């Protein structure tokens, strides 16, 4: 995630101008390889046309260039590109909106589950670590960065997310499907045992705890849904062929023809096709942001910091349910008292 919100707080003179001098998360970083390939191909074709070709073959190439430049507009690159990018951005913000945050649940665990002894501490930590374990189990499946941090469940044991007893229980409960749902059933059964044991005073608190847990379950299920059900491959293939064919055509039709021939539209012979390179910038950059936000759980600069979210959720939850349980600041009159 590249954050520049503080730099664009106010609309000032050239507020977006200072953002053009960035490299992390920039469009130049996503575009330089493709632009170098396109530049090399364009200038190789130019050197073939200007030097290698015989005059009749030069005339044939000029006719081909005019033919390709006159029909470049037949390719609806803007249409499919806009549809694809709109869908990608909608799915991207929906994928972020379904990232689970245990803050409501950890507040309810710190409040409802009573006991300042070691047993209540253990119970609260186990419940909120069940929540965090389910979250990290779904993030291990939907994110390549989290999977590279935790290649196996034993790495989750070494990271304090899973106890060896939980690892053995999860290996015992193995099925040919993903096992991210198991900590939710564990949470339900442990909360029922806590209520039956007197640690939870009323079943309405149990209902609130399980409602927050089920909201987290729905968010994790939506994450699994977005990881499994991708944008249809046909859309990706169509938009890729659109952009690639558009600029493969521009490799020939946007060549600067011989000004001695006095072709209409080719009177001035420049070396650098500034407008064609700007079109490459815009369209291929649109394609590259589609390629970057299609899976926002990878390891791109603008992809989500899911490892940081995992660590923050674990640390904050364990602080909230253990050190902050019935640990309140002294209740004193405020400044506006009477």
């Amino acid at each position: 995630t590249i954050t520049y919100t503080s730099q664009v707080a106010n609309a000032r003179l050239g507020s977006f101008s200072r953002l053009l001098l960035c490299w992390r998360g920039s469009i130049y970083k996503l575009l330089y390889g493709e632009f170098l390939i396109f530049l090399l191909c364009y200038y190789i074709i130019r050197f073939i046309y200007r030097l290698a070709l015989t005059e009749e073959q030069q005339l044939m190439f000029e006719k081909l260039t005019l033919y390709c430049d006159s029909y470049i507009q037949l390719i609806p690159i803007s249409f499919v590109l806009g549809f694809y990018v709109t869908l990608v951005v909608t799915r991207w913000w929906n994928q972020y909106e379904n990232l689970p945050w245990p803050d409501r649940l950890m507040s309810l665990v710190s409040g409802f589950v009573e006991g300042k002894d070691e047993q209540g501490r253990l119970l609260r930590r186990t419940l909120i670590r069940y929540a965090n374990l389910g979250n990290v189990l779904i993030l291990r499946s939907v994110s390549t960065a989290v999977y590279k941090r935790f290649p196996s469940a034993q790495h989750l044991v070494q990271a304090g997310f899973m106890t060896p007893a939980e690892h053995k229980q999860l290996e015992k409960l193995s099925l040919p499907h993903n096992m991210f749902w198991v900590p939710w059933v564990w949470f339900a059964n442990l909360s029922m045992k806590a209520w039956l044991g007197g640690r939870i005073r009323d079943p309405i608190l149990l209902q609130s705890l399980l409602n927050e847990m089920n909201t987290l379950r729905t968010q994790c299920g939506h994450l699994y849904a977005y990881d499994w059900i991708s944008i249809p491959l046909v859309y990706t293939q169509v938009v890729t062929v659109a952009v690639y064919s558009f600029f493969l055509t521009c490799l020939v039709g946007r060549q600067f023809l011989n000004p001695a021939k006095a072709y209409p539209g080719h009177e001035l012979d420049l070396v650098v096709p500034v407008f064609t390179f700007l079109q490459f910038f815009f369209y291929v950059g649109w394609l590259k942001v589609a390629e970057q936000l299609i899976n926002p759980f990878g390891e791109d600069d603008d992809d989500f910091e899911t490892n940081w979210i995992v660590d923050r959720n674990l640390q904050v939850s364990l602080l909230a349910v253990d050190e902050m349980h019935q640990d309140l600041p002294r209740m004193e009159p405020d400044m506006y008292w009477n």
Copy 2:
């Protein structure tokens, strides 16, 4: 469902290029028959024009070709195509979002419904199988793959979704409407009997169970709504006529005329209309993805794996409510304990 999310985790050099070499769920698989028909018709017309036609008829065909090529832009294929595809994609993701998952409900069943004896086991399995039976009853109606797996309710009896007593009860309760709603009333009555029998300790747990069941009912009702209320047939007919008329016009207007006549725009005579074939690719592929995602419960490569979802839901629910009821891993201090 064709999944390629892991292949596009990072925006790399030609990340979408490697996706062009796929066949399952590809646009070539959806386009090859139509493209072969279009190619055959185009080259038959070309061979008729170049060989069979008399010179005056060739002049008439050239005038007709210019007339058709000058007015190809009168057809708003992009407009109706974009509207139709946007509506199809919105409805497609809404249809996936309303696929029922019993995970919240099965967690509540494993927690609230008490009893490690055979009667509590039977009660929990019957409740969660009522949920799964309602889900499979609506998926039998909205999905052709599930209907091919279960042509009748007796096939659901052979698959363990329905007991013969439930089959007899459902045959007794027959009405001229769909009977997918019956297991929800069964769930409500059985949960009421469980609460009155002491298996459910508090009615707030009963309320939570029935709230999850009613959420599943709303999702299944939305599935039935999307199956019943299709996109209006007028839209499909209009977009089909748009694409078909566009490329039936291109069958004539995009023909390469005789370069000896020196027509404006037909100076260079190629054999393969690369731009016309690219337009066919893009537009007819847009139409084909509309045809593929219009009913995402069929048996296309990119259609939902509803049989897998049915099997996974049944297996996971029966594991969660029976083997995982009050079966917790040993509660031990974690790595960050004190």
Copy 3:
């Protein structure tokens, strides 16, 4: 409602082609009268130009035709047409999504309200018929088909939706506003009396019943809102004038001029303006689907089957709350038992 979902389950060779041979809910049925009027006007103008007009008046008509054909693009028919149709489709699916279904409420009535005697039967049937009566009272106001089935509340008495006592009470409570909200207050008071009488064991069940009833109230209020607050008449007038002016211009500018005059763009003289008729097809069909989905509760082929929904809701609710109350299939071990 025209359903063709099963016919488009798989993307096959010409899947949308077989849908062009339909008549119910087709675009030809919505377009034939307007197309015949347009055809008659176009050919009357053609016969006036080719035969009735003097040569100088023919020259004036040719200049007028060129003037109208050169400025046909000044009319933004696609812009307003797309905005209007998108709004119509969004409102159409929102109107369907707010059609009340009493299934959750009838499950809660069959579960919570106890008593297998005649008094409990009467209570459950009265509650669920209050729900159905409110639904049919709002559908009588928002739908012309339901209003033609029930021109008065006495027709609702003859249809079993309302008892004569309820009809007298509703006549007594008459106000100059719509009285669809009355059965909700009746439901609340009757549920309170049921809870105070011991028929409902806990007030949490009362809360669940009234929550489902209030959800139905919100859906019916949204239906009343969509019936009352129409799309602003200015939008309809603007889009109608756009389409009508576009094709009134095409009545003159799309005429085939005399090829002897050798006008640019009018070299070939056909009889049938295929492209103009295709444009009429697409644009006027877009307008006609806007006209058909603007009020989806009428009696069009693609309009909702609201009478069927009313009958199904009444029948299913009365079956669920009366014959299915505490009437469960025998609870027996399933196939996967141990």
Copy 4:
């Protein structure tokens, strides 16, 4: 609000044609003044060009007219107009969706709050009038029609919405912010007193009452948000300048030049610019509907009937909580009994 839903129930021959003969809520009523001003300016410029100008100044004006007509397409009126109108319509339906309806709350008040004596009557009427008073307090701030009906809170006292005791209490609680939130705190405290006094039997009913009241609070807060946070003035200025500059350019560039000069595109000299007037119709009407739906609480023909909503809510709520409390129709078997 102009309602024509019943007139467009069925898609008939010229269904939208009959809507062109309306005046209330019509586009002619919103467009006639601007169209008369544009017509007067256009014909004044025409009379200056044809009569007042010297021949050299006529040549200069012809060159200026060609220059303006060739660059009329540089103004993206359709782009900003579509964005602005889409945003306006979305905000308009969101503003209607957040209009508070007390029907759910009044049903809960008629049910939960017990007592057929004068004290229970007073309590129920006071609670539902607190709800209606909060609604009318926010509508007095967001609507100019409601503010013209009630210029002060004393007018609300004269209208029965506020008692003099409530007016004195609200004057005592005065702060430099809007005081529409006060009746919600009044409702909460009065409901707590009702529950503590035995009028509300269980606190779950208290929770339901306060949940409905808080939903009304959220709707009124959204109304206050839409009144306060307008569409940014920059958007309005940009779209207004776009339309005004487009048609100020059309005042010169769309003039009919002298046909004796034989200018290309100005061969035929008409008097009425039909296409320019149609463009004015469409674009300026789009602007006028943006001007009409930007604040849907004013006194336009298509603006909301907020005074009617206020009166209906007050009357219906006072009928529901007072005359309909425990006043049920006789519970008798229906037509389908056994």
Copy 5:
């Protein structure tokens, strides 16, 4: 926030015309610096071309100007500009919709938490100030105006939002993440202590209080999400390069060439490029509103008045929970009594 809702209540003759004479929140205020820079560059280039350049260099500049003006349409400024502005506006209204309002929670605190003594007063004020402290802690992080008002937590102590005991507790609980979530855990623990101490009579009221608090937590988490996860920097860079390249091209291609050369399209030599300046107005103003609404928590004229919201929330909450607790107006019959 610039409010003009009352000025556009009715669609009158030139309703949007009076809004063009504004300066605060106007497009001229956002555009004058860029327009002056563009004007200076354009006229410097004009003076170089008309005076400094030799005749051959003037011919070269004329050819370059024609080349740039013929390919200005290759830049899709409207496409990326519309996508970016639509995304910005959607995110802007979503950011406003997640601004926390404690009105529902403060009503529940004033109702549920009993006690007119000093201890109940202290408890209610502490709970609602926990809510306001969490809100101001997230607004200090997402808003530069709130951060300039409160550069440190000691400034929050001086502003009455935080007691020194709370400041010490928050310093003790310091972690390398944002600490806005702490007052929610404080609220949960204090509400649990209030319920255990008898101040809250039933745990259902505790559930309602914590549900409102958790809704506020979700809103603040969404605010933190929008502050952290910005629009990807690639989009901003692409749209900025699009606008800047478009008008850097217009700096050369929109120059008025020598009319003596009689170039096609440059016959009339004006001094002021009115159409180019209008295009700058529209497109650069679209870019500037994107720059202004990208972070709506800064200090722009149209940015949110977050300091006012903070002050109003604090004042209104402290009035509602302290002075309005069990302080009701006298319950008397209204005007429509019997």
